[PDB]
Structure formats: C-alpha cells, structure tokens
Amino acid sequence: SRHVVICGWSESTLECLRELRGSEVFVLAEDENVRKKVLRSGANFVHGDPTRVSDLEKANVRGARAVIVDLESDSETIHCILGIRKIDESVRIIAEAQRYENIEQLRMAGADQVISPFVISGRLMSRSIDDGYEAMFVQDVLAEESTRRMVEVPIPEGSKLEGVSVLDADIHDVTGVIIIGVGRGDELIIDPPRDYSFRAGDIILGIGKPEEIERLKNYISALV
Amino acid sequence: AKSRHVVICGWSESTLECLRELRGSEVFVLAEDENVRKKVLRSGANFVHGDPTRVSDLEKANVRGARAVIVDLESDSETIHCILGIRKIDESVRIIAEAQRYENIEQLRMAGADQVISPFVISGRLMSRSIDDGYEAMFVQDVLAEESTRRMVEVPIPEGSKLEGVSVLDADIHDVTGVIIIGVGRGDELIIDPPRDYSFRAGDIILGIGKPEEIERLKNYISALVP
Ligand SMILES: [Ca+2]
Ligand SMILES: [Ca+2]
Ligand SMILES: [Ca+2]
Ligand SMILES: [Ca+2]
Ligand code: NA
C-alpha cells in the first residue's frame, strides 16, 4: 500500500515498472531525458542524484515499502545504499549487481536482496548449449503470459496443514500444484524432504495453473 | 565421444560467467577488444582477435562445425549483424544470443537465433517480485549454482525406456525417485508441469529438480528394459 522508490533508470527498472503498473512508484534519477518515458509508464519522476542524501529524502524513502537500486556502477550503487541506510535502517533494499565480485559489498552496505542479471544470464547461456529447456522454463514462469504461473502462497495460522508432513499433505496429488520449495525468513529450501512438517508463516513456492492455485489456497486455509 | 567446440562472439560480464561453467570444454572467444586476452586464457579458453561482424574473422573463430555459438555484443544492431554473418556460413549451427532491449527479441529470432536470453528482462521481473520477500529471486539464483544441494538437470529418456507409453500419473516419478518433474521438453517445445495423462515417448527430455542421489535413482528407473 506504500510507494516503492526506484533509484536510477535502466532496462531493468523499465521492465520493473511494467510489472508494477497500478502501483505508486517514484523514480529518482538525474537523466531528464527519461522523464516523459517514466511518466508514460505510470510512475512519478524526481530529478536528483540518488547518491546524494538530500535527494533521497525528496523521493521519500522513509515509509517506502521497498527501494530498488540500479545505478551505473556498483561503486555508485553502494554509495546509494550507504545513503539510504543513513536515513532508514529497516527499509527493504533491492540492488542489482553488475559484477559477481561486488555482491558481498552490496549485502554489507545493507541490501536485503541482490539480483545478479549477468550471472543468471551467463548460467542460462552455458546450460543452453544443447537445448534451451532451462532457459525456456525460467523465462516462462516469470512471465504473466504463461499458462503456468510461479506463485508464493503463505500458510496461515490455524491452517489445517499445520504440523502435517510434506509426504502426508499430498499437495501435488490433491491441488495439482507443484511444490518447488518452502521459504521462511530469508531462508529457502528447494525440493523439501518428505518429512518436513509445515508451520504457519512458511511460504509455499509453487508452479501451477490459476485454477490449481485456488484449489491450493482452499486446501491450506483453516477448516471453518 | 565428446562434443568439443563452443564459439563465443564478443566479451561481457555475461560471457565471463559463462566460461566459468564450461571449464573442461574447448572454447573459442572471438572479440575485437584486445584487453580481455589474458583474462580469457586464465579461464582455460582460446582467444581470437577479430571483428565478430566480419564474416572472414568469424571463419577464424571456427564457427563451422561448432556445437553452439554464443553472441553477446554491445547493441542489438551489432548482435543481429553478427547472427546474419554466422548464418551466411553455417545455416544449421545452434545460436544463443543476448537481447538488450525487449523490443528486439523478435528481430533476433528472425535473423536466426535459436534461443534468446534477456538478462535485463529476467532481472527486471525478479525485482518486481522481490518487493515483499526474495523467494523467487532466491530460487532462480540457487538452482543455477553448482554449490546448491539441489540441481536442476536435463535427463533424456532412452529408447526402450520402461517409461515408454506410461502416463505421468502411472509413472510416479517423485514418489519413487524423489526428483521433482517441473517439465518435459522435445525439440524447441517445453511443457511446464505436464498433465496427469501425458505419456512419455523416447527422446523426451525430463526437466527435473533433485539431489544427486535422487538424480541417479531416476536414471536407473527410466533406463531401457533391455540393456
Ligand atoms: Ca543495471
Ligand atoms: Ca498441475
Ligand atoms: Ca551484454
Ligand atoms: Ca527430492
Ligand atoms: Na520507513
């Protein structure tokens, strides 16, 4: 319900705005040539340097639900995260790493999540030498066009799945949704063991048709 | 019995992380930027100094008879001109190209790219999903790693497999082998999460997620009946 702030303007943040249509987003960047393109994308543009602390206030990082940082280099990206933390220590920061070497320093400055496009892209290229099935899979489930969506579904308190093992729940046989993992806090287990027992607050990461997903949500709700 | 020849056109941070996963394989890197020479050699690859857009220097990188060719140049304009050059040489060799702008994906496929990776689109769509929690972003970046306990692997169904003509429901792959079937592919088509009655054919590739112990337990299950 709260404004997202986006620092810097790039092809990444352009595809980000396209998925945040309807939401309130501020874009703090120094390139005045991107104003009219930002506005056409349903966001607000703020002219300032994202590395300067005073210009971060104008984009109202305090009380943002999240901040996404993608600047020219990792040096300036770090400087921006350092600047953000000098204002809000708890606000969620998402940063894009250019080079793999710099991931550690970004996390250190205070990024809660680091995205590494050139590393993902390189590892999909190397796996696409014979066939493109993995690269197809990734680029499909992250799309809104796909028949199968990858979704995050929380297990609520009083859920009739509380304390049930993965084996007993039989989620795929019941709902038709494939459980590719369950996360909690900042830890995620891919392909959970058969004996893992569900807790409230666990987030189920799945793949399935919109119809399968609704059957899943009704399956993990409380009995009532 | 080993495919021995990948060609790489252009040098970027992408193609750099690509080389880290092709260690052991024979790789040629064609680029006009001379500064990356020693950086290429330390990755266990061979360097070719030339323009990837000039057809004669594409000959020198040994494009003909390559198992695949990867193109990542500065612009989408320059990437296309390189794909056209490659096609003027080998019309059947497999090409993987990196798109800068989303608008240009169609033109890249048109020129002859068999697979297009769009890094800025994948990352951009990952950022929008990482607003609340980073679980999609964690999953995508983890299954692609060598250190992770779970691997995403591609496993071909051999001729005479005991899965030939068996439905997904009857095969019971996860309950038996422990591997999660996230899809089955063939040619340039991939079905994500195949329906309960899909029947396996020889030549099908299973896209799966599992522990190495689970992966081998799977291969013995889909092996041929007559060895
Ligand atoms: Ca960027
Ligand atoms: Ca399903
Ligand atoms: Ca590039
Ligand atoms: Ca498993
Ligand atoms: Na705040």
Longest dimension (CA), chain A: 57
Instruction: Pick the ligand that lies closest to the CA of residue A122.
Output: 3
3-state secondary structure of A75: helix
Q: CB distance from B190 to chain A under 8 Å? A: yes
Distance from CA of B18 to the nearest CA of A (A): 5
CATH code 1.20.5.870 region(s) in chain A? 117-146
User: Ligand 4 centroid to B143 CA: how many Å?
Assistant: 13
Superfamily of domain B1-118: NAD(P)-binding Rossmann-like Domain (3.40.50.720)
CATH code 3.40.50.720 region(s) in chain B? 1-118
Distances (CA, A) of B165 to A31, B154, B162: 59, 20, 8
Task: Give the CATH number of domain B149-227; options: 3.40.50.80, 3.40.190.10, 3.30.70.1450, 3.40.50.970.
Answer: 3.30.70.1450
Name the residue among B94, B138, B125 with its Cα closest to residue A139. Answer: B125
> Chain B, 57-76: which have a CB under 8 Å from a chain A CB?
67-68, 70, 72
CATH code 3.30.70.1450 region(s) in chain B? 149-227
What is the phi/psi pair of residue A174, to 5°?
Answer: -95, -55
Method in brief:
X-ray
Name the residue among B100, B135, B121, B118 with its Cα closest to residue A19. Answer: B121
H or E stretch at A11 = helix A11-17
3-state secondary structure of B138: helix
Alpha-carbon distance of A198 to A159, in angstroms, equals 9
Question: Do B101 and A12 make contact, defined as CB atoms within 8 angstroms?
Answer: no
Architecture of domain A117-146: Up-down Bundle (1.20)
Architecture of domain A1-116: 3-Layer(aba) Sandwich (3.40)
User: Ligand 5 centroid to A92 CA: how many Å?
Assistant: 9
Tokens coding A125: 């290229």
On whether the CB atoms of residues B44 and A146 are closer than 8 A, the answer is no
Q: What is the resolution of this structure in A?
A: 3.0
Of B15, B119, B207, the CB nearest to A117: B119
**Dihedral sign (CA A120, A37, A85, B128):** negative
CATH code 3.30.70.1450 region(s) in chain A? 147-224
Instruction: Pick the ligand that lies closest to the CA of residue A206.
Output: 2
Identify the closest residue of chain B to A92 by CA–CA distance.
B131
> Chain A, 90-149: which have a CB under 8 Å from a chain B CB?
92, 94, 96, 98-100, 112-113, 115-143, 146-148
Strand A203-208 and strand A149-154: the pairing is antiparallel
Q: Which residues of A touch B22 (CB under 8 A)?
A: 126, 129
Hey, what CATH class is A147-224 in? alpha beta
Superfamily of domain B119-148: Voltage-gated potassium channel (1.20.5.870)
Tokens coding A184: 């909690």
Alpha-carbon distance of B46 to A202, in angstroms, equals 48
